[PDB]
């Protein structure tokens, strides 16, 4: 029941979304600002370690419970 590790490929802090590249080397996963666990964050930086769950929705695979490092 692990959580995937991955990298913030890029994040657009104006629009509130970006992409994470999982370590398992699968699809780029969509990350939305609402999926970052509160605590005064609401923005991620290019190329930083993150661990997260992956949810498969109608629009594609999305990052859940995104945590820094």
């Amino acid at each position: 029941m692990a959580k995937i590790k991955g990298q913030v490929k890029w994040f657009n802090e104006s629009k509130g979304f970006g992409f994470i590249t999982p370590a398992d080397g699968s699809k780029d996963v969509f990350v939305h600002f609402s999926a970052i666990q509160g605590n005064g964050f609401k923005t991620l930086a290019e190329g930083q370690n993150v661990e997260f769950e992956i949810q498969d929705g109608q629009k594609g695979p999305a990052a859940v419970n995104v945590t820094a490092i």
Partner: protein
């Protein structure tokens, strides 16, 4: 365009429900306002952007933006926007006075993603709203959207796997959020594909009903792709209905 009464019934019919046309996962604040404005404009206005961006959309003469001035009374059906936070917030006004107003809203508490927060009626003592978008309501009830050719089943072909499909020659431009295109078949169980980026577009030649979605079929770099484009209610015949679009068609 729909009536103030229909907006009232829509607002209350959705009290306690999760409003998720998709876009962003879960029940976000902008999902509720987008669905609401789509409904009362009989499909003419699909707002793009975050909650704060809502005042930047093209309302096609169907609504006025007002600034929140200390004299301004929100009214039933108004859309309340908070512009001065990072991504903003947005609410469907139910009733207003100069001291406070009440509204239906999603993700006020931050539970929209996890799903424990649904569309809820709360009270606000002017705690950050900067604008109010007032619909130009019509005097009579309207069912234009419900009977529109887009919500009319019509004639569809069907393959042995239960996919309804039609030929259609048009262009689709992706809206504010990206969408993952599926290789070879309109199936959310197909894991291959690529992220169709916002504001990108493609010509397409086929439309499908599959997996609770409307899809476009198109060709790109030698590969056949299927892109989900809006929700389908799963029903055929006179019960058929599809949701607000995830991009713009032409």
């Amino acid at each position: 365009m729909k009536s103030q009464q229909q907006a009232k019934e829509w607002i209350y019919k959705h009290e306690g429900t999760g409003v998720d046309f998709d876009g962003a996962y879960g029940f976000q604040c902008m999902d509720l306002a987008v669905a609401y404005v789509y409904y009362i404009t009989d499909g003419k206005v699909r707002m793009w952007g975050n909650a704060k961006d809502a005042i930047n959309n093209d309302f096609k003469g169907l609504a006025t933006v007002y600034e929140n001035t200390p004299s301004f009374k929100p009214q039933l059906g108004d859309v309340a926007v908070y512009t001065n936070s990072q991504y903003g917030h947005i609410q469907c006004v139910i009733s207003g006075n100069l001291d406070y107003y009440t509204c239906l809203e999603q993700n006020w508490l931050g539970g929209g993603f996890d799903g424990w927060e649904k569309a809820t009626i709360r009270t606000h003592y002017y705690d950050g709203v900067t604008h109010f978008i007032r619909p130009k309501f019509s005097a009579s009830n309207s069912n234009v959207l419900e009977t529109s050719k887009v919500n009319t089943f019509g004639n569809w072909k069907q393959n042995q796997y239960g996919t309804y499909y039609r030929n259609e020659n048009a262009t689709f431009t992706c809206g504010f959020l990206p969408i993952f295109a599926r290789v070879g078949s309109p199936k959310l169980s197909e894991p291959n594909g690529y992220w169709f980026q916002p504001n990108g577009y493609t010509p397409y030649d086929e439309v499908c009903l599959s997996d609770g979605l409307v899809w476009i079929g198109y060709n790109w770099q030698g590969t056949r792709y299927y892109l989900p484009v809006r929700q389908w209610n799963g029903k055929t015949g006179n019960s058929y209905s599809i949701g607000l679009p995830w991009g713009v068609f032409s």
